[PDB]
């Protein structure tokens, strides 16, 4: 029996149908070395093209030899993929459209929910499923760190044959991406494959963030710049994440993507202007600041040379209020019990079940040369604690919205909030 290396063993990611998106299920494997699962190969090929859907290679004298002997199934491949993902080819055992556009895009959201790309976001703006917004924060290695842009995605209706179409909505200082948003990018015409998803698309676009193409410009004068003088380009580049992308400027740390995505936790239809995010940003960045420093302290006085979750926790109940510091220890706590009875995951933040940055908290708790050294559990423990906290305010925020007619939280509803609970003013007051 077809037997593999084990290091040769497929994933189960390298085992999904380029067309439907779906696990190989009796794949069809071309004479041109194409494969699709059966279903896919009735409704694109043998009804109708008699073409690959990948190279157009036509194969109706193949299709003719093999479906009258019932030879069409690569047996091999189909062997391998049933012995190591049983179940998934169970799920699909029992059916005969497969390849039409409306089932691909919700496959691939499904598949988003279950793995998100590098703190990417995508999803329907409404009930059109052809009509996608997305969210991609700046990477860190590049002039965009810290920002959050928005970009719009539309489907064509021949989705996954033909490209989608993606285009940014924040305006950025990109020598491949115009006024408009327009961006000029391969995988996204010249380099497009039906096996290609929106995932890879917004893993794409960051790395074209990271690095950009000056050869091939949008914007020449941005590729000139780029090309002469890097810092020039590097300081505009910061400088319009700040104005038009919710950056700090580089000065300080933006939190802003996080901030969003427990905004649309607690209140789902409601934004945030940029002025706002700015005094949302400045609290986390204070609270890390004054946990932080305390907990150096607390270890510096105890002749403790690591700062950890007890530490924090200590640190917490002298700087909060009663009903604050109990709510905030009760949620580091649970995020450290969970962390650690957790399996490592694709991010520490999901293993311990938070949206902000259990990675960057640690990597700042040691650059800001707090103590000799940081235990795994302090970050935890701190990110969950401002995420706490950013919630409770943007809850009262978005409450203060609703109040006055808005749809968006600007910073009169932030000051409002604030002023009007006695502990978080207490706590926050002196920031303002
Ligand atoms: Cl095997
Ligand atoms: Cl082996
Ligand atoms: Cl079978
Ligand atoms: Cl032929
Ligand atoms: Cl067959
Ligand atoms: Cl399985
Ligand atoms: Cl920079
Ligand atoms: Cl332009
Ligand atoms: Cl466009
Ligand atoms: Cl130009
Ligand atoms: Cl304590
Ligand atoms: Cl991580
Ligand atoms: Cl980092
Ligand atoms: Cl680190
Ligand atoms: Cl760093
Ligand atoms: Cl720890
Ligand atoms: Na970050
Ligand atoms: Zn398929
Ligand atoms: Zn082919």
């Not at 029996?1 to 149908?17: N, V």
């Not at 700046?138 to 179409?165: A, C, E, M, W």
């Not at 650690?340 to 949206?355: D, F, N, V």
Request: proline content about 6%; charged content about 25%.
């Amino acid at each position: 029996h077809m037997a593999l290396p084990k290091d040769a063993i497929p994933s189960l990611s390298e085992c999904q149908c380029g067309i439907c998106m779906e696990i190989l299920v009796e794949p069809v494997t071309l004479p041109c070395n194409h494969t699709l699962c059966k279903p896919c190969f009735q409704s694109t090929v043998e009804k109708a093209s008699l073409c690959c859907p990948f190279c157009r290679r036509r194969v109706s004298s193949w299709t003719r030899y093999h479906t009258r002997r019932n030879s069409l199934v690569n047996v091999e491949l189909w062997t391998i993929i049933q012995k190591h993902y049983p179940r998934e080819c169970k799920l699909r055992a029992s059916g005969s459209g497969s390849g039409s556009a409306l089932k691909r895009i919700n496959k691939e959201l499904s598949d988003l929910a279950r793995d998100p790309p590098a703190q990417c976001s995508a999803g329907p703006v409404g009930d059109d499923m052809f009509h996608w917004q997305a969210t991609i924060m700046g990477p860190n290695d590049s002039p965009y760190q810290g920002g959050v842009f928005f970009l719009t995605i539309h489907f064509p209706t021949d989705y996954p044959f033909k490209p989608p179409k993606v285009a940014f909505t924040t305006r950025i200082y990109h020598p491949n991406i115009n006024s408009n948003g327009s961006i000029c990018l391969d995988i996204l015409r010249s380099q497009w494959s039906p096996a290609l998803t929106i995932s890879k698309v917004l893993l794409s676009i960051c790395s074209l963030l990271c690095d950009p193409n000056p050869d091939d410009p949008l914007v020449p004068e941005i590729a000139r710049i780029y090309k002469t003088d890097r810092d020039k380009y590097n300081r505009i580049s910061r400088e319009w994440t700040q104005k038009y992308a919710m950056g700090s400027g580089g000065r300080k740390e933006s939190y802003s993507i996080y901030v969003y995505k427990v905004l649309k936790q607690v209140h789902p239809d409601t934004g945030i202007s940029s002025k706002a995010m700015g005094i949302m940003n400045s609290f986390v960045n204070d609270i890390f600041e004054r946990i932080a420093g305390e907990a150096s302290r607390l270890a510096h006085y105890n002749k403790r040379s690591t700062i950890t979750s007890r530490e924090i926790q200590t640190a917490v109940r002298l700087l909060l209020p009663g009903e604050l510091a109990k709510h905030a220890v009760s949620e580091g706590t649970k995020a450290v019990t969970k962390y650690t009875s957790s399996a490592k995951a694709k991010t520490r933040s999901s293993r311990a079940g938070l949206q902000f940055p259990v990675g960057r908290v640690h990597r700042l708790l040691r650059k800001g040369n707090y103590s000799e050294r940081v235990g795994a559990g302090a970050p935890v423990y701190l990110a969950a604690v401002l995420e706490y906290l950013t919630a409770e305010i943007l809850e009262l925020a978005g409450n203060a919205a609703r109040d006055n007619k808005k749809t968006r939280i600007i910073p009169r509803h932030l000051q409002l909030a604030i002023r009007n609970d006695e502990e978080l003013n207490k706590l926050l007051g002196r920031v303002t």
